[PDB]
Design a protein around this ligand. Structure first.
Ligand SMILES: [Zn+2]
Lengths: 162, 82
């Protein structure tokens, strides 16, 4: 079976964008970061996103900012659900209060843990429309580094479908 | 005497042949390698059975008294972003 690392193109349904942005904007109106996940099915070097998951999550204030935590019971439930549905976890998405980037916390405690997974960061509590050139995106390499996928590459990789 | 453990990680199964005299953490390491899950180190994952019981990863496989094939779920202890 082709590994997730070999994915080069991604089909993202518009409705899956809408469910991410609705969640991020909603908790962002309360000053919180949110987290969402994109799951789907791989075919060779192509990946079709099928659903958005909004995991059960808590909102915590840190020394300098905010974070969102997904509890162990929910990460287990996610694992089982993916198995039952025949789905694969491609990406995590979260929001920042201001500028989007991968923090030290982001680098260390990702949910999307497989080589080849994506981690997208949405700025300004998702107040603006979701835009693949506005996010800060990262992809996990075989050395467990979250390397930047710049806007040009990201907008080539991911096509929003309707 | 070997146990065939199907370990499921982010919904992806991998079959690990387990020696009874080996602790369960040996299976954790192999399953994460096989499924390419590297973003958090092995220390940060835990095993649950099909009833949600958390398994002691330091216990020798033989001391669980497993059937010849068993399925275990290997899942993160925590996920954090911000
Ligand atoms: Zn962050």
């Amino acid at each position: 079976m082709t590994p997730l690392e070999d994915v080069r193109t991604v089909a993202l349904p518009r409705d899956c964008v809408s469910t991410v942005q609705a969640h991020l904007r909603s908790v962002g109106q309360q000053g919180h970061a949110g987290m969402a996940l994109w799951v789907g099915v791989q075919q060779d070097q192509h990946f079709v996103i099928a659903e958005t998951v909004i995991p059960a999550q808590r909102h915590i204030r840190t020394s300098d900012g905010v974070c969102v935590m997904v509890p162990a019971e929910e990460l287990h439930r996610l694992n089982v659900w993916l198995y039952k549905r025949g789905l694969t976890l491609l990406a995590q998405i979260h929001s920042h209060p201001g500028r989007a980037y991968h923090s030290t916390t982001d680098d260390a405690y990702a949910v999307a843990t497989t080589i080849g997974c994506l981690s997208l960061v949405v700025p300004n509590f998702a107040r603006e429309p979701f835009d693949l050139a506005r996010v800060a995106a990262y992809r996990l390499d075989a050395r467990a580094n979250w390397n930047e996928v710049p806007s040009a590459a990201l907008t080539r990789m991911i096509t929003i479908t309707s | 005497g070997k146990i065939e453990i199907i370990v499921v990680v982010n919904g992806q199964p991998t079959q690990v042949e387990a020696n009874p005299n080996q602790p369960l953490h040996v299976v954790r390491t192999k399953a994460l390698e096989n499924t390419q899950n590297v973003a958090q180190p092995p220390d940060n994952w835990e095993f649950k059975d099909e009833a949600g019981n958390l398994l002691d990863v330091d216990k020798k496989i033989g001391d669980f008294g497993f059937a010849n094939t068993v399925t275990l779920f290997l899942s993160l202890k925590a996920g954090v972003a911000g």
